[PDB]
Amino acid sequence: NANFENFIGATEGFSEIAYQFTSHILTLGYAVMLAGLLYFILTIKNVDKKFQMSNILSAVVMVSAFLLLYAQAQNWTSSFTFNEEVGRYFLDPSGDLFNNGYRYLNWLIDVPMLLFQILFVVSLTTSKFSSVRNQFWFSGAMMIITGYIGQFYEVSNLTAFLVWGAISSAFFFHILWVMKKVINEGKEGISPAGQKILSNIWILFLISWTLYPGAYLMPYLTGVDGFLYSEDGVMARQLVYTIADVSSKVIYGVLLGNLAITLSK
């Protein structure tokens, strides 16, 4: 499937470093998700019943993430193979080829649940649960779908690639706007400690989620002839994605659990 990983792998190839590093950073990804899974399971008892749906959604996200990131990892290593002559790893015809599908599926599943789960920890004031939920779920699904559409043109048609990226961005923008409202309403009438944690959650959410569109554009951030437009851009992209995954899923989940506990007090 015509993507950048495959482009680079089929033309320049990947240095030992780029291929080993990338492989290791992916393994950390799914490793951390597994640890996260066990954490959210074990600690579920630490929060009042009325918050436990958040912990549950954390656990489920962990399952999803671990399975698909693990599959992704195996895909990476399988797709590229070493050539003694040039001393680099090249896209392997006997392999399945690298597939972004695993990640974009993970997003499709995880995005709704991550947005949903905060609604079980914080209380809204003037907004309706059902309104916020539907707005999250819709825009979350649209954002990933348009992104996925765009990813097809990454190499083929960099114009459409960006256009769909921008449409995706629009939906992203809508999500941020709703989450801002949720968090602000969540703060009213809770302890300053809780407000502290909600402030932190916002920042983590804002940064961690923005990493994704960053890694999506990563290869072209230096132009077509740029440094990033290479195995290094693949390296960077996958690193950032992995940093975003851990942040947006595990750390996000941890913080919500901590918020829940202060609200039990």
Ligand X SMILES: CCCCCCCCCCCCCCCCCCCC
Q: Scanning residues 181 to 210, which ones bind ligand RET (CB under 6 A)?
A: 209
Element (H, E) at 80: strand 80-83
250 near ligand X, judged by CB under 6 A: yes
Residue 165's binding partner out of ligand RET, ligand X, none, with CB under 5 to 8 Å set by partner kind: ligand RET
Q: Name which of 187 and 237 has its Cβ closer to ligand RET.
A: 237
Q: Among the candidate windows 38-46, 103-111, 120-128, 223-231, which touches ligand RET by CB under 6 A? A: 103-111
Rounded to 5°, the CA angle 5-7-13 comes to 80
Tally the C-alpha atoms within 13 A of residue 3's C-alpha that lie toward its C-beta: 20
36 near ligand X, judged by CB under 6 A: yes
Task: Judge contact between 88 and 15, C-beta under 8 A.
Answer: yes
DSSP result, 30-69? HHHHHHHHHHHHHTGGGS-GGGHHHHHHHHHHHHHHHHHH
Give the chain's length: 265
247 near ligand RET, judged by CB under 6 A: no
Q: Among the candidate windows 12-20, 110-118, 192-200, 221-229, which touches ligand RET by CB under 6 A? A: 110-118
Q: How far is the CB of 102 from ligand X (least distance, A)?
A: 10
d(CA 26, CA 3): 18
d(CA 161, CA 116): 29
219 near ligand X, judged by CB under 6 A: no
238 near ligand X, judged by CB under 6 A: no
Q: Name which of 115 and 250 has its Cβ closer to ligand X.
A: 250
107 near ligand RET, judged by CB under 6 A: yes
Cα 109 to the center of its chain, rounded Å: 11
136 near ligand X, judged by CB under 6 A: no
List contacts with ligand RET (CB under 6 A): 107, 110-111, 114, 143-144, 147, 165, 168-169, 172, 209, 212-213, 216, 245, 248-249
